[model samples]
Target chain A: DAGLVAEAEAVAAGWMLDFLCLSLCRAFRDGRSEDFRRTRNSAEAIIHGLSSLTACQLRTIYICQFLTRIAAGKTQFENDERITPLESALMIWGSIEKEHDKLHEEIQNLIKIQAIAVCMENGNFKEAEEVFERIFPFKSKLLMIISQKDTFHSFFQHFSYNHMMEKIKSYVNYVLSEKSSTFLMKAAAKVVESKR
Target chain B: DAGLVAEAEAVAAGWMLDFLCLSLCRAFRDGRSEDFRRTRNSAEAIIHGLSSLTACQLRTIYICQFLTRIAAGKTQFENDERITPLESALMIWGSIEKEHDKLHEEIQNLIKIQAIAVCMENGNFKEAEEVFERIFPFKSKLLMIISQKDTFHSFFQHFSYNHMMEKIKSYVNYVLSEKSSTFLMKAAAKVVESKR
Candidate 1:
């Protein structure tokens, strides 16, 4: 399988790139069977195909990183600066996964709440709203707060998405940007001011 | 107004916090006239109220940044640690705005196109799909991209507001969080790379 994929990817430059994503689709594609072998094989094909590409190729780096983020894949190359796209993908995704666990609980819960809306997991839309209204009552003199609506669909689509992953992708796009990093660095610093 | 807000916020930790978002909503609520004056006045109120908050207040900082983002508002506080919620809001919005012009075209274009899908500004939706089929003959060859529908709508809330500001207020809640910023950072980087 590895030899077949390697020979297939070696054909040339243009199709070489297309084959990477196609190969990835195979890896990322969810399967019904609990075949660990399939995932391992898919990972190997990607590792070989990607490892062959020049480190500096434009789209390859991001593609590698994207899949790596989704897959938690790793690469043999360890150095950061000179590492190839394949290496970077492995490194970046590994890093993203590594940090995921240490994230604070409050932050995790808040993000989960936010993710629901971002995903429009409005799957619970009608039911959640009904429950919220009954529990809080729309006009809460006790707390002097309007009930947090089950959803905020009206002006909501600004951050809305079709699938949960797409929402994360868009968010990853924004937070990853150099511009957002400015806020992120600061936000990271403010840390847990919420409790104060 | 400044004195009243401060006294109110100091009244015990609870109400003071509530004061931040309410304070920010005032700044972001744009009016019909060339009302830079209203925005300015509101900004003044927020600046004073927000600036007065202690720098270390965790929830305060996020709430301020969160609101500042929605209002697309900004202020002037360069130092990261010392910046109060009020000061940070102003500065962040200012910076977010200033960079809009200088964004490299590739990032700008990719983001713009992505924004269309993110915002569903394709606002055409169902009718557009039908109209295209009637007008174009390439259905067989071109299955149609339909349009790039991307998302993380689990957290979606339609901004069904008559006002633009309302939409952002809701967005700020989802986006201002640390988790969202984490993703937002990568998204920004991807925007720049897509062009190369």
Candidate 2:
């Protein structure tokens, strides 16, 4: 009976936070400046609740939903002078790091890719080429893993995976030309030998 | 002759970046906002040179100094932008990570201690207490290692070893309450029995 009541309270609190976070994000997007402060207060209150929970407790479905809303809402308030929302978001992410090391790595790699894309966007091709060159050593290994039918099916379930791999391949070919083609052929031969 | 010229150019470029980075750091400390841009440009140029150099070439004393300057200066700029400097710093530190994991752990623990001290200075006792709690579990192992005077003295210089052990004792008492002390004692005894 006690556990059920506690769970119900947690669910109710999470729902309240989610509502406030969505309201805040919508208000910010619509430039409803008057609502910003109240929205921020509500998000901060949710963050306090999050900090109080044990790591396992924080992973409960309702709490996770609440945290996701809080993190998403924080992005809308990026221009707020009183808060460092990015740092707060990273701290929340860091709390989940041990549980989600692979996800963290993917997020970090995505950030690096975005940074490289930004360099390219600014017409810094030389810089972009450098970025391409930096990832070349890992290219063969990643491609080898991707080539397996089972691996490809399991890993490339999302369109984004296909898109990212295409970019990686295009960037490598652009930078390495004949050298890359030769390497890919060699890599395929090695895979064939392993199967034999 | 062309290779020689390139090497010389690299050396000179590195020195220029190092001098500029130090100057920029001093300027920022003195609130000289104008110098920040110039310093960053210097860093960008140094990074270009670093990107071109092979991993082997980077080990040369002059090149290493240049890389270090670029890293430290880049971190200062990132910090000024209110971004986390740790990730960027990690890239530079990656080369040493595998070979120096133990040293890295020790450095991290030291940094945690300093962070707690900062929190205490800001009158955030609750925050400091939380950090202290996390650190307390390692105390028994650290204490046992210190108690091995010969082993400790061999690892740390004799005078430093004595000094560190004394400080560790004081901190252990300050941070660990009666319950924690009892826990650590049991843990230490278990470790000794296992060793035997």
Candidate 3:
């Protein structure tokens, strides 16, 4: 407890520390109830609830938010120099003890999407596929969204992507009655402008 | 009454016609209490249904389906050699008698995405802003998605594509308490890889 406060107090003493601090305030209450062990996670929820977590559980959510920035080009973790947010969030997710929490699950999915985005950005298809599998553990849901356009996007991203696209075309055609005419007419309107 | 069968018979009489027919007879009676003038809209539903319409009615719904195909990189249409799907969908929207359908509304939203897609595809931002207006109609749903990656893509698909990326980022974030840990680790693992 003293160490945690010391860590912050020392930091606040030196810099313009604009941060909120929290603690679990747990005591030796026989730790036997259902909320007993899970209490930490509950506090962790609020602990990291507002933020400032990374290698700590808070870090996992923090990194997930940063993934959007990295993907969007708003933030760069490593550049001419390695940025700290990137460095720490990376550490938190890496070191975290695995367990379940509602937000943790959300963080899990975000990281996967992030990984795919990063890999796709770097043209790393195999890794993107691995990440995609995590994004959609469903063979069925995977097939629904995959299409020629996805293949087009996945060209350098993967090889199975081609077959994936083929299936999507067949999937759409199999239920020709299934597609919206409004959407299709839009497609035809663009075809061979010479027809116009 | 004869016009319906007459149109069918004329097409059927062609020398080398290709045809298949199915008749599922669900008997119907026209008693004035119901089955009223609204029947045409239903037929119009399948008219734009079973894979067909837009404005002029057909013109509006017709152009929207085409937008997806165009986005998938299918190419067509014209007052000129370069009649675009955006032009047709816009023209169809402009030309149509106002009727509503689920897909048509989606197309109205979609063509905005489509135009955003095409504009981003062709570096047409100078004119694409109008398209984005129809895209969100509200002002904010549009900004929620745009970002540097979109600019990057506006550069050849991903300087960041931040807007689209953010949604996925948020998508997972909102439902976050939902993912698995192994994946989030992969993100952090990659993040600190060089550092590791």
Considering summed lDDT, which 10 consecutive residues are worst modelled in model 1 chain A?
A5-14
In model 3, which regions exceed 4 Å deviation?
Answer: A1-196, B1-9, B13-83, B90-103, B127-196
Cα TM-score of candidate 3:
0.21
- Native RMSD of candidate 1 (Å): 27.2
Model 2: docking quality category: incorrect
| lDDT, each prediction | 0.34, 0.38, 0.32
- Comparison by TM-score, 2 against 3, better one: 2
lDDT by residue (tens digit), candidate 1, A28-129:
443212222332333333233233555434443454455543343221332444333323333344433233454323222323233334222435444333
Candidate with the greatest lDDT versus the true structure? 2
The lDDT of model 2 is 0.38
lDDT per residue for candidate 3 within B6-90, as digits (tens), equals 2222221110000000000000111221222222222222221122212233432333233222323213343452445555545
What root-mean-square deviation over C-alphas does model 2 reach? Answer: 27.9
* Two-chain DockQ for model 3: 0.01
The fraction of reference interface contacts (C-alpha pairs within 8 A across chains A and B) present in each candidate is 0.00, 0.00, 0.00
Task: Give the TM-scores of the predictions, in the order they appear.
Answer: 0.18, 0.21, 0.21
User: In TM-score terms, which candidate is top?
Assistant: 2
Better of 1 and 3 by lDDT: 1
Q: Give the DockQ (C-alpha) for candidate 1.
A: 0.01
Looking at candidate 3 chain A, the ten consecutive residues that score lowest on lDDT are A16-25
Taking chain B only, the TM-score of every model is: 0.25, 0.31, 0.31
